[PDB]
Amino acid sequence: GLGYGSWEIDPKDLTFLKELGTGQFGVVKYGKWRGQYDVAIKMIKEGSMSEDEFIEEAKVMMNLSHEKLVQLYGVCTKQRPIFIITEYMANGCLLNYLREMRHRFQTQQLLEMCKDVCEAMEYLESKQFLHRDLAARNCLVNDQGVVKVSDFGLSRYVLDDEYTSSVGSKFPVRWSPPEVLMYSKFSSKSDIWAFGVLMWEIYSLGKMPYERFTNSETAEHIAQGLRLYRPHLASEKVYTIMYSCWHEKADERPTFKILLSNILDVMDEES
Ligand SMILES: *CCC(=O)Nc1cccc(Oc2ccnc(N)c2-c2ccc(Oc3ccccc3)cc2)c1
């Protein structure tokens, strides 16, 4: 209504029900929109984000729509802190979910999680939209066990330089290809690399990648052409798929479309 752009939600329409946690942007809450609809509400800590650039990009993000992509509903601006309003993912972040051993996952379920994410990434790829920080910690799980990709693109607007470049102590070294670590060369192929690392995370039930190394050591390992190896729960066909994301040469890495086809083939073959 009056005073609100299409990308703009009225905060007054929100009822907060439960606190969900605190990240580097701060607090995230579960609540309702206009009394009925489940939403998540992420509150951006003052001073943490390039807010104007983000708000403008929010307009683009609103047009992104896929069943395996966390749906942005809108943003609450001209209040501090600003809110990001999205669909609510009841079972939380993929990473913690994988580490909960009680689930006793079948490898079928793990392959499906991979397929969930790969569908989202094929969609983003089809819209020439890079994630830039794909990892288990950023994927979410809904009440039906479906995995969706979240925080897509968001790292572009983080002001904390510990997060922003390779020479930073909070950069995702472990999810980065050699050309990112060496030259900061981002592309669809650095999203691919990170996806194979995510398949590894999934098949490893949430182990941190290169868990015995520091980031610095990991970068050296990668630069020398050494790689993550096969998780116990991954078949040879699945390992082949994740390993193919890590070709030293970016143009030799597959697309998300080819990855999806590979994953469907393995699914049919191991069904
Ligand atoms: C595994 C790490 C972890 O604990 N993450 C975590 C913890 C608490 C709350 C979190 O965010 C949630 C939780 C549940 N549902 C949703 N939707 C979210 C959430 C909400 C908003 C955003 O922001 C963006 C989403 C999509 C695109 C850009 C921004 C992200 C997650 C997560």
Side-chain angles (χ1 to χ4, degrees), residues 103-207:
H103 291 292
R104 294 162 161 100
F105 295 123
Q106 302 186 249
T107 51
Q108 188 161 358
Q109 292 170 277
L110 305 173
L111 189 54
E112 187 84 20
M113 296 173 194
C114 296
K115 177 165 99 60
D116 282 342
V117 170
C118 189
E119 281 168 1
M121 297 298 311
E122 188 202 16
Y123 176 79
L124 291 175
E125 184 175 66
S126 82
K127 304 293 194 209
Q128 295 80 50
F129 191 110
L130 288 207
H131 194 284
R132 273 167 167 115
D133 191 16
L134 185 63
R137 69 191 170 255
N138 284 329
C139 291
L140 300 171
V141 189
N142 76 1
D143 67 352
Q144 304 300 316
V146 177
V147 178
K148 306 197 174 189
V149 170
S150 132
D151 281 348
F152 33 95
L154 193 61
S155 69
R156 288 170 296 170
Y157 316 109
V158 175
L159 291 179
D160 202 346
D161 295 20
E162 297 320 303
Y163 281 99
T164 71
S165 87
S166 131
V167 204
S169 74
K170 289 198 153 62
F171 184 92
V173 175
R174 298 166 193 271
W175 292 264
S176 294
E179 74 273 5
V180 157
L181 297 183
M182 288 158 74
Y183 310 129
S184 298
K185 194 182 189 308
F186 293 84
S187 66
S188 60
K189 303 311 183 178
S190 51
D191 268 7
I192 294 281
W193 181 287
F195 175 81
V197 173
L198 176 42
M199 293 187 59
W200 187 95
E201 284 184 283
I202 288 173
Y203 279 88
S204 298
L205 301 185
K207 280 193 192 331

Side-chain angles (χ1 to χ4, degrees), residues 20-38:
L20 292 173
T22 302
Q24 289 294 304
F25 292 114
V27 188
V28 182
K29 288 188 182 151
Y30 160 66
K32 292 290 203 195
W33 183 80
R34 303 196 167 166
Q36 299 194 242
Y37 300 89
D38 284 356

